[PDB]
Amino acid sequence: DKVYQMKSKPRGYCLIINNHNFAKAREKVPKLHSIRDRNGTHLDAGALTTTFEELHFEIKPHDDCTVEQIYEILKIYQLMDHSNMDCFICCILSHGDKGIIYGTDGQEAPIYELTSQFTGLKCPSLAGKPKVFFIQACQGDNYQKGIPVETTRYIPDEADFLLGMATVNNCVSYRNPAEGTWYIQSLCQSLRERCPRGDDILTILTEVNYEVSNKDDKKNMGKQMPQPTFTLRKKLVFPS
């Protein structure tokens, strides 16, 4: 069947928004008076770096970004020319709540206001090309419960998107300060294992769903359920 073209070197840019220090949030926003620094997030940034460099992307890391700073960054890559690129990736590592992610200042950036900056109209050099977003953040403060089981041509403006959420809405996602987050670490492991095999991203994200689903938070009897969304029209593979 149809497969997105993926032969350019580099494949495209891989943005990494890596939020660790939330002192501004603790100071300015009363609601987030005790929101914690995201210790161990560099383990995700590093794993993402290693993984997508192996997949021939050019990594563009940005540390400790407020909401306005994130917007500025996205607007820059929105206005850039991706004509010689076959793909675009944006990884966000931060705190969040339902439908949003927090900047280090504790302000809110709705996820749709992030992804929509790279629609075909707003970023024509990425038209027809896969745009992939990975969001590592909570989407609420609820613990996901567990359940027992037995062991020319015109296309839509919002085409070719892939949104990989670390969790379903309303619920938390986990970060091990000594290992990284459940979602990102699992994602990078699956990518590095299955991309050389030629597996597509939906298959890999399915495996990620399976892997994270088997992890437990024994302190609160919590689980985590990642949730991909996509408008992809072709199979997405990352040759190596």
């Binding site: 995201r38 969040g96 670390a166 938390v172 970060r175 987050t181």
Partner: peptide
């Protein structure tokens, strides 16, 4: 374990 911590949450985001």
């Amino acid at each position: 374990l911590e949450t985001x």
